[PDB]
From Swiss-Prot:
Keywords: Acetylation, Actin-binding, Cytoplasm, Cytoskeleton. Occurs in many kinds of cells as a complex with monomeric actin in a 1:1 ratio. Interacts with PFN2. Interacts with ACTMAP (via N-terminus); the interaction may facilitate efficient cleavage of the acetylated N-terminus of immature actin by ACTMAP. It is found in: Cytoplasm, Cytoskeleton. The modification N-acetylalanine is found at residue 4. This is Profilin-2. Its main location: cytoplasm. GO terms for biological process: modification of postsynaptic actin cytoskeleton; modulation of chemical synaptic transmission; negative regulation of actin filament polymerization; negative regulation of epithelial cell migration; negative regulation of ruffle assembly; positive regulation of actin filament bundle assembly; positive regulation of actin filament polymerization; positive regulation of stress fiber assembly. Belongs to the profilin family. GO terms for molecular function: actin binding; actin monomer binding; ATP hydrolysis activity; phosphatidylinositol-4,5-bisphosphate binding.
């Protein structure tokens, strides 16, 4: 695996149709953004934010929301540590009154996949995409 490689990979999502941004984000010994699509909020994800995503407390975020690149979000459901699934579904908060966007997270062995839907893109299909990407990346050693 290569970093120009990782940029190409995440850039695929901007040809997909589903999505307005994507990122690959390490969560173990390289806990930072590996690659993110240009001009989004995911490029700004921090270690503190990653810690919340992967954290042991998997209920507090239902009351308090969480941020991603400092953007406020709500957690819709969490199966990140359910071995057959390894996803979470998130929604950005607005505004007042701007559009909201759905976010799917998939967890591989050492990286996280984040994708953000375009306007009106439902969470289900995003979830499947993140699930599939996670699996593919696991298969590749990540």
């Amino acid at each position: 695996g290569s970093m120009a490689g990782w940029q190409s990979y995440v850039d695929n999502l901007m040809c997909d149709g589903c999505c307005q941004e994507a990122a690959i984000v390490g969560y173990c010994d390289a806990k930072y953004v590996w690659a993110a699509t240009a001009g989004g909020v995911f490029q700004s994800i921090t270690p503190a934010e990653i810690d919340v995503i992967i954290g042991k407390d998997r209920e507090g975020f239902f009351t308090n929301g969480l941020t991603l690149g400092g953007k406020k979000c709500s957690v819709i459901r969490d199966s990140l540590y359910v071995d057959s699934d390894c996803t979470m579904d998130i929604r950005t908060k607005s505004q007042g009154g701007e559009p909201t966007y759905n976010v799917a997270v998939g967890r591989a062995g050492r990286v996280l996949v984040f994708v953000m839907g375009k306007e009106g893109v439902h969470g289900g299909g995003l979830n499947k995409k993140a699930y599939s990407m996670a699996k593919y990346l696991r298969d590749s050693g990540f």
